[PDB]
Design an enzyme around this catalytic site. Sequence first.
Site, short mmCIF file in Angstrom:
data_model
loop_
_atom_site.label_atom_id
_atom_site.label_comp_id
_atom_site.label_asym_id
_atom_site.label_seq_id
_atom_site.Cartn_x
_atom_site.Cartn_y
_atom_site.Cartn_z
N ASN A 149 -7.84 8.14 -6.04
CA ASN A 149 -8.66 6.97 -5.89
C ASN A 149 -9.57 7.40 -7.87
O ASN A 149 -9.35 8.63 -7.96
CB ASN A 149 -9.57 6.24 -5.26
CG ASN A 149 -8.96 6.09 -4.55
OD1 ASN A 149 -9.42 6.35 -3.00
ND2 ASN A 149 -7.52 5.02 -4.69
N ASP A 169 -6.23 8.17 -0.93
CA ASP A 169 -5.70 7.18 0.64
C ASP A 169 -4.39 7.40 0.82
O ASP A 169 -3.80 7.89 0.74
CB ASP A 169 -5.16 6.03 -0.18
CG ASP A 169 -6.79 4.29 -1.00
OD1 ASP A 169 -7.41 5.13 -0.50
OD2 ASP A 169 -6.55 3.85 -1.44
N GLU A 229 0.88 -1.24 0.09
CA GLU A 229 -0.46 0.55 0.00
C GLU A 229 0.69 1.20 0.14
O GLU A 229 0.52 2.39 -0.61
CB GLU A 229 -0.94 0.05 1.19
CG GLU A 229 -1.88 -0.75 0.99
CD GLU A 229 -3.29 -0.49 0.43
OE1 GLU A 229 -3.02 0.57 -0.57
OE2 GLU A 229 -4.39 -1.31 0.07
N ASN A 281 -8.46 5.25 3.34
CA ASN A 281 -9.50 6.08 2.00
C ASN A 281 -10.62 7.02 3.04
O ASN A 281 -11.04 6.92 3.74
CB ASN A 281 -10.39 5.80 1.05
CG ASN A 281 -10.96 5.80 -0.30
OD1 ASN A 281 -12.48 6.24 0.13
ND2 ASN A 281 -10.28 6.06 -1.01
N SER A 321 -11.51 10.07 -3.89
CA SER A 321 -11.44 10.49 -2.74
C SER A 321 -9.84 10.01 -2.52
O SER A 321 -9.23 9.60 -4.10
CB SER A 321 -11.76 9.01 -2.28
OG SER A 321 -11.53 7.51 -2.84
N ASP A 345 -15.25 -4.78 9.57
CA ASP A 345 -16.70 -4.41 8.42
C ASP A 345 -17.23 -5.04 8.14
O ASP A 345 -18.23 -5.47 7.17
CB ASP A 345 -15.98 -3.20 7.82
CG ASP A 345 -17.14 -1.95 7.12
OD1 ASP A 345 -17.92 -1.87 8.04
OD2 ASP A 345 -17.35 -1.58 6.24
N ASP A 392 -12.35 7.30 -8.44
CA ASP A 392 -13.40 8.01 -7.48
C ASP A 392 -13.66 9.43 -7.19
O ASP A 392 -14.48 10.05 -7.28
CB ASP A 392 -14.16 7.05 -6.57
CG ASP A 392 -13.93 7.11 -5.13
OD1 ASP A 392 -13.09 7.99 -5.42
OD2 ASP A 392 -14.39 6.42 -4.57
#
Length: 129
Positions: free
Chosen positions: A46, A52, A35, A59, A50, A101, A48
């Site tokens: 990202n 990280d 990562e 995110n 967003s 989650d 979209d």
Amino acid sequence: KVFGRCELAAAMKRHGLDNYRGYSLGNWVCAAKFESNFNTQATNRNTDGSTDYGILQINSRWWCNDGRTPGSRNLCNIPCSALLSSDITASVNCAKKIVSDGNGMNAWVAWRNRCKGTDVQAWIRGCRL
Ligand SMILES: [Cl-]
Ligand SMILES: [Cl-]
Ligand SMILES: [Cl-]
Ligand SMILES: [Cl-]
Ligand SMILES: [Cl-]
Ligand SMILES: [Cl-]
Ligand SMILES: [Cl-]
Ligand SMILES: [Cl-]
Ligand code: NA
């Protein structure tokens, strides 16, 4: 801060990630390697819109507030900038929420594609832990 491999393993063990929700420490080190390259200051945009943040590339769509991700949640209740600290506490506490989650470590695309199903114990080999 750019962590050494065994340095990061020790810091993650201290913070209780060893076998957290059944993921051995090597999984977490492997995820961090792919990562962020163990760099707390890592940021990546990202598709979209967003972003990280930090050692575990957490995110802004769901987990932290960076002020510029429309319609986003802040489920760890933290500014994203806090995830870039040399102190990994905030990152680890947030990661505990993410991994609990429902989808486990599959939330980390680099874990799923690069660590899952591999010999992850290799990442802690030689570390005094
Ligand atoms: Cl090290
Ligand atoms: Cl390495
Ligand atoms: Cl495991
Ligand atoms: Cl392991
Ligand atoms: Cl901007
Ligand atoms: Cl936002
Ligand atoms: Cl730390
Ligand atoms: Cl799981
Ligand atoms: Na957000």
